[PDB]
Amino acid sequence: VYAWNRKRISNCVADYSVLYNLAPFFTFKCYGVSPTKLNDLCFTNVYADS
Amino acid sequence: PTYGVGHQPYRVVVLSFELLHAPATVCGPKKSTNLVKNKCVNFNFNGLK
Amino acid sequence: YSKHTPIIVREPEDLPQGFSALEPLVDLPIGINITRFQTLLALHRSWTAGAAAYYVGYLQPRTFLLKYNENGTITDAVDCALDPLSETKCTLKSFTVEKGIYQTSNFRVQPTESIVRFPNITNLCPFDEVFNATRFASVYAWNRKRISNCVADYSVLYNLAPFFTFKCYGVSPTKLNDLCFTNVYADSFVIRGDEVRQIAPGQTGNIADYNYKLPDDFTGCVIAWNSNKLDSKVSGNYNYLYRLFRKSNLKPFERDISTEIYQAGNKPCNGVAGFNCYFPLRSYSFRPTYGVGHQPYRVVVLSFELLHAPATVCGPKKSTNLVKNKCVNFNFNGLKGTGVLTESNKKFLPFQQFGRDIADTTDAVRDPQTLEILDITPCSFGGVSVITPGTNTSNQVAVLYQGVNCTEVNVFQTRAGCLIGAEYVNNSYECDIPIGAGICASYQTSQSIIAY
Amino acid sequence: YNYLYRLFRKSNLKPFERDISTEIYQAGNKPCNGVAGFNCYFPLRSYSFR
Amino acid sequence: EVQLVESGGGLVQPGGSLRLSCAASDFYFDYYEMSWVRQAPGQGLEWVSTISGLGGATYYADSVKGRFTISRDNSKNTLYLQMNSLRAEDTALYYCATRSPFGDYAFSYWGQGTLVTVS
Amino acid sequence: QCVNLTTRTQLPPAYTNSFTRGVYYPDKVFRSSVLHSTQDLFLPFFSNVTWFHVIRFDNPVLPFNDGVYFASIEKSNIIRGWIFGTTLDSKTQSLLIVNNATNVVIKVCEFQFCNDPFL
Amino acid sequence: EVQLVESGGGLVQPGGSLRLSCAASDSSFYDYEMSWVRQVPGKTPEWIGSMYPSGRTYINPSLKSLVTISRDNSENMLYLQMNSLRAEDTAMYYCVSNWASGSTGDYWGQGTLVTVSS
Ligand SMILES: *[C@@H]1O[C@H](CO)[C@@H](O)[C@H](O)[C@H]1NC(C)=O
Ligand SMILES: *[C@@H]1O[C@H](CO)[C@@H](O)[C@H](O)[C@H]1NC(C)=O
Ligand SMILES: *[C@@H]1O[C@H](CO)[C@@H](O)[C@H](O)[C@H]1NC(C)=O
Ligand SMILES: *[C@@H]1O[C@H](CO)[C@@H](O)[C@H](O)[C@H]1NC(C)=O
Ligand SMILES: *[C@@H]1O[C@H](CO)[C@@H](O)[C@H](O)[C@H]1NC(C)=O
Ligand SMILES: *[C@@H]1O[C@H](CO)[C@@H](O)[C@H](O)[C@H]1NC(C)=O
Numbered sequence: 001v002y003a004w005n006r007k008r009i010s011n012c013v014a015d016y017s018v019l020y021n022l023a024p025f026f027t028f029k030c031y032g033v034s035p036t037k038l039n040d041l042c043f044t045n046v047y048a049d050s
Numbered sequence: 051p052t053y054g055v056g057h058q059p060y061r062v063v064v065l066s067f068e069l070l071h072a073p074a075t076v077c078g079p080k081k082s083t084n085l086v087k088n089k090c091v092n093f094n095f096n097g098l099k
Numbered sequence: 100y101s102k103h104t105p106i107i108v109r110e111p112e113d114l115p116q117g118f119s120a121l122e123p124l125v126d127l128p129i130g131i132n133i134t135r136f137q138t139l140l141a142l143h144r145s146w147t148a149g150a151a152a153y154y155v156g157y158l159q160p161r162t163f164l165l166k167y168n169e170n171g172t173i174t175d176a177v178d179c180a181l182d183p184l185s186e187t188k189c190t191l192k193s194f195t196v197e198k199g200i201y202q203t204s205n206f207r208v209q210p211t212e213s214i215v216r217f218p219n220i221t222n223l224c225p226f227d228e229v230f231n232a233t234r235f236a237s238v239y240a241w242n243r244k245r246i247s248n249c250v251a252d253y254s255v256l257y258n259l260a261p262f263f264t265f266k267c268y269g270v271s272p273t274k275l276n277d278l279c280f281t282n283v284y285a286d287s288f289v290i291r292g293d294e295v296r297q298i299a300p301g302q303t304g305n306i307a308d309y310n311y312k313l314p315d316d317f318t319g320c321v322i323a324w325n326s327n328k329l330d331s332k333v334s335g336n337y338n339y340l341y342r343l344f345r346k347s348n349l350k351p352f353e354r355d356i357s358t359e360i361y362q363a364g365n366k367p368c369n370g371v372a373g374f375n376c377y378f379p380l381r382s383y384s385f386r387p388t389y390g391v392g393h394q395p396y397r398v399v400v401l402s403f404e405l406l407h408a409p410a411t412v413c414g415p416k417k418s419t420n421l422v423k424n425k426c427v428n429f430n431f432n433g434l435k436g437t438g439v440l441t442e443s444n445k446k447f448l449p450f451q452q453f454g455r456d457i458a459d460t461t462d463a464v465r466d467p468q469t470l471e472i473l474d475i476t477p478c479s480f481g482g483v484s485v486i487t488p489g490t491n492t493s494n495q496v497a498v499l500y501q502g503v504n505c506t507e508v509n510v511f512q513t514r515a516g517c518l519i520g521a522e523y524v525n526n527s528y529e530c531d532i533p534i535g536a537g538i539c540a541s542y543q544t545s546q547s548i549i550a551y
Numbered sequence: 552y553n554y555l556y557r558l559f560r561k562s563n564l565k566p567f568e569r570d571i572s573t574e575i576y577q578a579g580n581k582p583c584n585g586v587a588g589f590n591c592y593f594p595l596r597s598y599s600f601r
Numbered sequence: 602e603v604q605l606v607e608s609g610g611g612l613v614q615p616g617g618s619l620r621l622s623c624a625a626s627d628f629y630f631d632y633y634e635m636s637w638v639r640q641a642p643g644q645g646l647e648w649v650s651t652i653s654g655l656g657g658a659t660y661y662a663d664s665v666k667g668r669f670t671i672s673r674d675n676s677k678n679t680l681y682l683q684m685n686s687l688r689a690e691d692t693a694l695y696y697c698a699t700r701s702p703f704g705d706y707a708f709s710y711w712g713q714g715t716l717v718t719v720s
Numbered sequence: 721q722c723v724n725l726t727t728r729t730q731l732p733p734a735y736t737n738s739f740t741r742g743v744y745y746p747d748k749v750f751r752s753s754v755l756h757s758t759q760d761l762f763l764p765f766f767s768n769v770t771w772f773h774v775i776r777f778d779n780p781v782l783p784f785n786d787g788v789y790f791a792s793i794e795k796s797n798i799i800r801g802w803i804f805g806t807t808l809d810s811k812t813q814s815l816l817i818v819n820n821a822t823n824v825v826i827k828v829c830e831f832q833f834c835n836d837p838f839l
Numbered sequence: 840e841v842q843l844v845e846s847g848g849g850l851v852q853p854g855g856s857l858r859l860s861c862a863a864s865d866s867s868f869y870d871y872e873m874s875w876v877r878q879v880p881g882k883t884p885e886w887i888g889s890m891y892p893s894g895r896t897y898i899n900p901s902l903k904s905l906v907t908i909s910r911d912n913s914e915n916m917l918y919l920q921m922n923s924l925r926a927e928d929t930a931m932y933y934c935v936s937n938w939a940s941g942s943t944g945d946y947w948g949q950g951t952l953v954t955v956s957s
Contacts, residue, residue: 020642039078121744156769158787158935
């Protein structure tokens with residue numbers, strides 16, 4: 001967390017339908033966009049924080 | 051290991067989006083269909099619906 | 100506030116006929132509760148009281164239209180609620196009102212009652228075997244009666260023996276009979292009088308730790324009434340049993356059915372009950388001649404559970420009396436508002452409960468318990484008009500209630516409303532102040548406002 | 552056992568007002584005058600901090 | 602504090618059976634409420650069942666209630682869950698958790714949880 | 721100290737008319753040649769205030785609901801302060817004001833008052 | 840569904856003893872607490888003995904070392920032997936399995952006629 005990498009994703013085909021697994025989530029939500037139907041929207045630049 | 055779930059490391063991943071006046075480059079795995087002309091259709095372009 | 104000014108002439112010792120502004124002096128850091136005061140005098144014991152006189156009055160929440168001068172001094176003021184002329188000058192934001200009719204405010208009466216009239220109470224919780232049984236239970240072992248879907252009406256418990264504790268922990272006794280829980284368990288037992296205090300969340304006591312252990316976060320109630328009248332046998336009352344010896348304390352809401360022998364020493368007893376080997380069970384001694392601390396008390400607690408299940412137990416309803424021919428607040432289980440409840444002749448259908456109209460508003464409801472169609476209509480309201488011949492002429496005004504029969508607020512009824520403050524003459528003059536429906540007012544002659 | 556708190560009141564207390572009146576409540580019609588029984592409760596509870 | 606875990610999840614054929622017998626280490630359960638919560642992929646923690654500690658009744662769930670049942674011997678620590686006639690949409694993430702009555706519905710310490718899938 | 725002074729007869733008070741008096745500055749804002757409308761606690765016109773007169777030691781404890789328009793008219797300066805509070809039974813706080821001939825002594829404490837306060 | 844209890848009684852026999860025994864039908868009696876309660880008109884509650892599952896018994900402080908209770912399982916019948924019969928013992932004894940801490944599923948018998956009068 002002290003130096004969390006801001007991994008940028010570009011020129012990709014993101015599939016937001018495989019992240020469902022074990023290790024119970026915290027009710028994965030999307031503040032700003034819709035949680036589902038993300039496969040119909042196309043983004044130009046996104047950042048991932050771990 | 052004996053501590054309860056009240057304090058356990060959660061692998062929180064924050065995926066921040068960004069949309070400006072630029073051509074998009076990453077969308078979902080939607081198969082692009084065929085384009086027909088001279089007929090009213092429901093276009094579903096990157097940012098056009 | 101204060102202001103000092105002398106007099107102009109030898110007054111009759113009354114309040115002068117003048118206007119004066121008051122300036123603030125001090126704003127001390129205070130705020131303690133103050134409701135009564137008293138003024139001190141200065142006795143000149145040469146006892147002589149001297150000569151003093153004050154005009155102590157009371158302040159009220161009012162609106163005032165203050166006139167500021169060019170130098171910032173208050174010169175005039177309007178009460179804004181004393182007379183219709185003051186209200187007219189207040190709503191016009193002036194002091195010299197012209198001749199004509201002016202609308203000041205809107206007349207509207209206020210409700211009187213707050214009836215509810217909720218449906219009947221059919222499903223009654225079983226309280227005949229937990230408050231009227233002969234022998235509830237002992238102390239070493241207690242009972243637990245699971246209650247099912249019903250409405251817990253605690254108002255019926257007034258028929259028990261008086262002077263009984265009703266300390267409800269967690270929940271509030273005032274809002275007690277409005278609570279939808281999922282399950283309620285009753286645990287009844289009989290103990291002494293000096294052990295009622297031990298029945299509490301986290302309190303020291305031998306019976307509170309060796310017989311019955313109440314949790315610290317217990318949110319329920321406890322009821323204990325005097326049982327010395329019927330649970331006191333003079334011929335050796337020993338039907339009750341309470342534990343006094345145990346290895347450790349009990350868990351919250353634990354059932355101690357173990358009857359093993361107690362060992363206060365180190366030698367094996369193996370069930371002898373002799374020297375250094377006592378039996379961890381002792382019986383009470385209830386006698387009608389003992390003190391209050393030794394009298395029997397039937398203690399019953401009600402543990403309330405809260406889960407995300409269909410709420411079985413709930414609270415009762417008020418269902419107050421219904422009043423007619425008076426604008427009151429109606430609460431017929433689905434609506435909250437004001438209106439006059441009158442008997443209607445509109446025949447409804449067995450499945451209909453509400454009633455609408457062309458204006459898409461409620462105008463008729465069905466009573467929940469006694470099936471009868473009512474007629475909801477708003478109270479009397481309209482517009483208050485003030486007829487003033489002008490401040491330069493006089494100060495007499497006439498009030499006109501638009502669309503009001505002036506029977507539930509000289510008095511003369513017109514087609515435009517009801518004029519109170521002007522007499523109707525049979526003459527016919529030119530129209531000076533238009534009122535409506537051919538009625539005109541004028542300030543003619545003994546000068547007074549007349550209608551014609 | 553030195554932190555106390557009220558439980559019920561006849562009406563919602565006005566803002567910025569202290570409720571120091573420790574009089575015993577009366578939720579019925581019979582005079583109580585310090586009995587603490589039915590329809591007569593003490594409107595002041597205590598915490599059980601551990 | 603408490604070190605309760607889960608054990609029993611596994612691949613079950615449609616319409617089979619399974620025993621999700623969990624346990625615990627040390628906690629006051631004689632007056633607490635033990636429940637079950639499932640987690641479908643992409644959904645929250647839906648309620649499954651609840652066994653009371655002060656009572657012993659079994660508060661059931663929605664239309665799938667006619668196939669599930671829970672019990673407890675109450676010797677040291679356990680919470681069973683009988684699976685009868687599991688359908689397609691019954692696969693989820695069950696978590697043998699508990700709570701405390703006389704308070705808010707916020708559940709108490711959860712467990713590690715297991716997974717059961719049907720195919 | 722406080723003493724119990726006897727020989728005090730009871731008499732009904734008098735009344736008068738408040739002729740458009742009791743207007744003060746509501747706030748500290750300066751206005752000029754305007755007509756502002758406030759909603760502060762003022763004295764209603766023609767409120768029929770009391771007329772307690774001292775010729776007689778008649779100083780009764782009068783209620784203080786929201787305000788008191790104390791208008792004293794005299795020459796020998798008999799009024800030299802006021803006493804406030806709730807009950808004056810040495811149980812709660814009480815405000816006190818004393819207007820001496822050379823200064824003003826205002827202090828709020830829990831003094832041991834009595835039924836006959838004077839100077 | 841069946842009691843099969845309180846079978847016996849006695850007559851006026853001062854200075855003797857009572858062999859009153861009340862059997863129990865074959866059922867799921869595991870945590871049963873058998874006792875004896877008199878039914879003299881005027882005093883309905885009365886405690887005599889106890890049948891705790893651990894085998895130990897409790898006697899009332901009044902009749903200390905006066906009433907002896909022994910467990911017998913040869914033919915499923917409980918025994919009770921007491922001595923020093925008084926004159927006010929005229930009552931109706933019962934063998935109740937659902938004693939105090941009960942009254943929810945409580946059941947009784949018909950009554951054993953036992954009376955003594957000098
Ligand atoms: C002040 O005290 C009086 C009587 O003691 C009573 O009105 C109430 O307790 C208090 N009122 C307010 C507004 O604090
Ligand atoms: C207002 O101030 C002016 C200038 O000082 C003065 O002439 C006038 O008399 C004042 N008005 C009043 C009412 O005192
Ligand atoms: C108990 O019985 C009496 C009379 O039999 C009755 O008046 C009373 O209401 C009963 N108690 C309750 C809680 O109903
Ligand atoms: C409610 O109780 C009253 C009183 O007996 C009865 O007249 C009325 O019919 C009841 N309501 C219904 C819907 O049965
Ligand atoms: C006023 O009431 C009287 C008496 O009921 C009635 O005759 C008259 O028509 C009413 N007037 C209006 C405008 O309702
Ligand atoms: C003031 O009120 C008193 C008491 O009601 C009354 O006797 C008196 O006439 C009133 N005075 C005025 C001027 O209204």
